Structure 1
Amino acid sequence: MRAVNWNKKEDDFSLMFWKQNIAQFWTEEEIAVSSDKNTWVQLSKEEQIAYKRVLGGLTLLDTKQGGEGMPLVLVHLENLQAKSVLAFMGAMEEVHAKSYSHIFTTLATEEEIDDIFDWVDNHPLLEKKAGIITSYYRRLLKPEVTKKELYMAMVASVFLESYLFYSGFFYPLYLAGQGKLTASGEIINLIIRDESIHGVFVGILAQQIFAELSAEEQQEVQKETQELLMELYEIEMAYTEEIYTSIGLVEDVNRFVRYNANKGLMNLGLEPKFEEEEINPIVLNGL
């Protein structure tokens, strides 16, 4: 039975990703958020509610990535060095999820926080998008999985990591790029720094598996990936309209969703699907 040996490379990249993930280690106690109270209180109630809602959705996605996505993908890997990096990534999803609570405890009353988790837990769009992603992960709950099943779980993980978070990341970046909620904006920027590297790494692993598929299974997975892309897109378009119609930003965020969906695809070594468009410089300045 094999032990992990870091003095003999199992691949060309797991060590550098390991070192970068651990270099980027952080926890919420390193950022005081209370100085955001000042700008929080100058936001309209629509702006506040949008911010809370998006953070709630992000919390849910990270809870699923830490609790199901990284653990079930990593258990089936044979590459012990790569497994290690995914275990570390998995812990950081929990650090991310807990981070949002740290922001909530400063910006919202105990009752307002109950409100938001009730809204998450009962939300039909969040349930649909989480249900879809996690159905690929739950296929892995069996002793032996096919390469195709593992590949599609990794596509789903990248689509979560690189694509589905961004309808949520948009708004904290937008506010931070205007000097509002800048402490919370820092925390969001730490999460994004981690997720950028998560997405690349999982996408490298997927590309490896794809090369081990037959020409046929390669076609089947391309067809499934395009369908998954578009089913999530339709959910995301409904989610952005729900969240941002009150504040006039639906078209802005839609551009940023498509931009990030193309980044996910590129992480998988696939061609972009959406035409390039001008993304808001204020959110680029919040990055």
Structure 2
Amino acid sequence: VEDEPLLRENPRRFVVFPIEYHDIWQMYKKAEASFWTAEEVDLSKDIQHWEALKPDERHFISHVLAFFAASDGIVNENLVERFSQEVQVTEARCFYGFQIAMENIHSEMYSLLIDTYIKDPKEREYLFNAIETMPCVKKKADWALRWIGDKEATYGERVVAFAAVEGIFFSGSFASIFWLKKRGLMPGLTFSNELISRDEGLHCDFACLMFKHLVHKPAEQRVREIITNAVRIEQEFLTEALPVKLIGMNCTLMKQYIEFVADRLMLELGFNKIFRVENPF
């Protein structure tokens, strides 16, 4: 850890200039420029849309939201307890500081959506505590949570795992909502999904950049395993627990998209693709 420029003790840590890593700095600036608030998303004309939806379509979206309701919180919780603490590089901590801020806005946004669509308190509580009620989302959350408590796994392994959490675990639901946008539905859901994804792409790229700034990191095979594990969990989620069929989507093309996203991560990480499949959308 003492040979790690990213994790080793840094006395200049508390001051921003002079910049040491312009690559990390530009990452933070892109995030800064992407700032937005939940208030900026107009959900006035969305309750009616939720009404028009079909019983199956609402079942889907409600469940996608159930998982998103706590997902960003889990991420932030890892950033606070681990990443932002571990990393001693000023510029990196700035990026993580803004990511934390944005994850909470994301978290707020999903709560608003659920609040806007579900008026029944029974269901509301049900979806709000999905990590304790919906085994569908319980699995994904537990996967993420484990990496936070894992006091053995290295930052290298853990940063890769969260790159999967923010990329692969978001991918499936992201595409589904993009699908609705295509079909011209739920303008609130699709608009925030666009903003959130822009942040998500940044959080993922950064994770890969931190990876590159790591000297002693996991071997390729270990990275392929972590990524592949996330891929399978996500596929199981959107083809079994909550089939994209419910909203008119091919479960097979969805499975392929996830792998495509997985491949994008591997490249960003500096490795070869695993699946070698084109984006089916």
TM-score range, shorter chain: 0.7 to 0.9
Matched AA of 1:131: D
CA contact (8 A) 2:99 2:203 kept: yes
| Number of the residue aligned with 2:263 | 262
CA contact (8 A) 2:27 2:206 kept: yes
**1:77–1:83: 8 Å Cα contact kept in structure 2?**
yes
| Paired letter, 2:171 | Y
C-alpha contact (below 8 Å) 1:136/1:149 kept by paired residues: no
* Residue 19 in structure 1 maps to residue 19 in structure 2: no
Distance of 2:252 and 2:136 partners within structure 1: 19
| Residue type at the aligned position of 2:158 | A
Deviation at residue 261 of structure 1 after TM alignment: 1.3
- 2:13, 2:157 → 1: CA distance? 27
Give the TM-score taking structure 2 as reference length.
0.87
Equivalent position SS for 1:62: helix
Out of 158, 168, 177, the position equivalent to 1:172 is 177
The residue number in structure 2 matching 1:190 is 195
Q: Distance in 2 between matches of 1:152 and 1:64?
A: 17
Partner of 2:154, secondary structure, is helix
The structure 1 residue matched to 2:228, chosen from 227, 230, 235, is: 230
- Per the TM alignment, residue 24 of structure 1 is displaced from its structure 2 partner at its CA by 1.0
Partners of 2:80 and 2:64 lie apart in 1 by: 22
Of 117, 129, 133, the residue aligned with 2:128 is 117
The 10-residue stretch of structure 1 (115-124 or 31-40) with the greater mean CA deviation from structure 2: 115-124
Distance 1:278 1:19 in 2: 29
* Structure-2 separation of matches of 1:11 and 1:232: 30
What is aligned with 2:205?
200
Give the share of equivalent positions with the same residue, in percent: 21
Task: Tell me whether 1:91 sits opposite 2:101 in the alignment.
Answer: yes
Q: Which runs of 5+ in 2 are unaligned?
A: 1-10
8 Å Cα contact 2:130-2:138 kept in structure 1: no
Alignment match, 1:243:
242
Decide whether aligned partners of structure 1 residues 46 and 152 sit closer, same or farther in structure 2, where only a CA change above 3 A counts.
same
Aligned residue pairs, count: 267
Structure 1 segments unaligned to the other structure (5+ residues):
281-287
Separation of aligned partners in 1, 2:201 and 2:229 = 23
**Two-structure CA RMSD over aligned residues (Å):** 2.0
- 1:37 Cα deviation after fit: 2.4
Aligned to 1:283: none
4+ residue segments displaced more than 4 Å: none
1:271 paired with 2:272, answer yes
